[PDB]
């Protein structure tokens, strides 16, 4: 009847026949037989909200790897039109229109999903207010909006990211002035922690990019607008910048830690995409740029590692080429390289959490979903050891 007598009847020891029957049926049912490159993959380009308004940031949902969050920033065609627009585009089915649309009063500069809330999009704007968008709500306006007080951000925010465990989260964000703040994802009226990033006493930092090493939340790497990358500690007696990197002679326009796990650790490695066409394979434990890939006349804009390849990483360009660099294969010519039509200034690359296919932003709002070949996407067991050897080379 109810769920108490079943416990006693299971505790009863007449189960020899049941166990023999189960063993026999399972052993008899054990036997089982049968009855009988770079490629343009998809587009995504609205027209109502994506007239000019270059792409700014991209992402994919961990809970929903079929979803991409964009953020088209610049309002110059029509002052009366909505200023900031973030569109979310689905991967499971092909629709010319974005799935869901969000607009903020200010101009959005960065956006990302929420790990805890799989039904929520958080984004940062140009004014300096961290902005929510509850997908449950029918209303396109921001749902919860952080105050523009001296407690919170007051400068154009450029990096927003939610991290931590499902039972212990923190929405970290950093602004151009360098005030890092962690909010609770469910309450943003007050920044539950904040601290202004500063180098050696009386030296402000113009933060413009960041990335957290996989797993770690306590320490991270930041790429400043002043071309000097740093590593900082989020929580601890040494909370703040703790490292000088000589880095590069131009603004840092992108950064990304290593994004692979399973074999010999490489979390200490990261790549920074400078402002002189110089991506920098380069590590925290050292201080000197490990290698300095250089080519071209224009300069890169963003760079990410491959989420599953322990060597591959993409590279934005000014004349519109996207290229993939496979260090184990080669360190000198891009392993793959194709140019988007119309040669506009690409502005953002984001790899799918699966890593099997890439996305790319654009200077005209036309997000392009590109696909990569299997031989160029998926690594091997020996690939990690080969990366170890290539890094041990110099």
């Amino acid at each position: 009847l109810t769920e108490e007598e079943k416990q006693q009847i299971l505790h009863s020891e007449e189960f020899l026949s049941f166990f023999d029957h189960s063993t026999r049926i399972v052993e008899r049912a054990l036997s089982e037989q049968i009855n009988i490159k770079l490629s343009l993959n998809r587009q995504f380009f609205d027209e109502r909200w994506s007239k000019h308004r270059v792409v700014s940031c991209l992402d994919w949902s961990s809970q929903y790897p079929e979803l991409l969050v964009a953020s088209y920033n610049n309002n110059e065609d029509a002052p009366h039109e909505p200023d900031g627009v973030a569109l979310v585009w689905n991967m499971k089915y092909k629709k010319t229109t974005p799935e869901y649309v969000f607009h903020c009063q200010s101009a959005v500069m960065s956006a990302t999903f929420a790990k805890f809330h799989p039904n929520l999009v958080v984004g940062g704007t140009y004014s300096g207010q961290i902005v929510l968008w509850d997908n449950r709500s029918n209303k396109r306006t921001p749902v919860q909006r952080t105050p523009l007080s001296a407690a919170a951000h007051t400068h154009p925010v450029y990096c927003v990211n939610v991290v931590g465990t499902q039972n212990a989260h923190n929405l970290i964000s950093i602004s151009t002035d360098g005030k890092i703040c962690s909010w609770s994802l469910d309450m943003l009226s007050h920044p539950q922690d904040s601290m202004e990033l500063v180098h050696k006493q009386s030296k402000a930092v113009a933060v413009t990019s960041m990335s957290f090493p996989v797993g770690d939340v306590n320490n991270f790497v930041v790429g400043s607008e002043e071309g000097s990358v740093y590593t900082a500690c989020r929580h601890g007696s040494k909370a703040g910048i703790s490292e000088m990197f000589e880095g590069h002679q131009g603004p840092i326009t992108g950064i990304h830690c290593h994004a692979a796990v399973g074999a010999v650790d490489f979390s200490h490695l990261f790549v920074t995409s400078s402002f002189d066409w110089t991506v920098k394979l380069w590590t925290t434990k050292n201080n000197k740029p490990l290698y300095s890939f250089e080519d071209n006349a224009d300069y890169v804009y963003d760079v990410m590692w491959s989420p599953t390849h322990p060597a591959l990483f993409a590279c934005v360009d000014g004349m519109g080429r996207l290229d993939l660099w496979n260090l184990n294969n080669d360190t000198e010519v891009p392993t793959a390289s194709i140019s988007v039509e119309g040669n506009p200034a690409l502005n953002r690359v984001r790899w799918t959490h699966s890593g099997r296919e890439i996305a790319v932003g654009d200077s005209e709002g036309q997000i392009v979903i590109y696909d990569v070949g299997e031989q160029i996407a998926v690594p091997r067991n020996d690939e990690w050891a080969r990366f170890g050897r290539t890094l041990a080379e110099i």
Partner: protein, 93 residues
């Protein structure tokens, strides 16, 4: 050992532990979604009772412990001993 059988059935591909349904149609063990598993197990109980009636119509000494219900998506093996009806979902591959 119940947990031994649970880990043994878990080893079978496409299977989530062991779920056992009694003569009431309510599973004595909980492994899948409760409403779906209960309604579907009541349907299995009805069909095995009617199949038992037919097999006793012409074979009054036969017993049912094996029944291969496979579709193009998944297969169920249902096994009644006398009250416990093991049901295991397993992919055809």
């Amino acid at each position: 050992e119940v947990e031994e059988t649970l880990k043994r059935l878990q080893s079978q591909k496409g299977v989530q532990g062991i779920i056992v349904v009694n003569t009431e149609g309510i599973p004595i063990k909980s492994t899948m979604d409760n409403p779906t598993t209960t309604q579907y197990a009541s349907l299995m109980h009805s069909f095995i009772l009617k199949a038992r009636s037919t097999v006793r119509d012409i074979d009054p000494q036969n017993d049912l412990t094996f029944l291969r219900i496979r579709s193009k998506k998944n297969e169920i093996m249902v096994a009644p001993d006398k009250d416990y009806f093991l049901i295991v979902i397993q992919n055809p591959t």
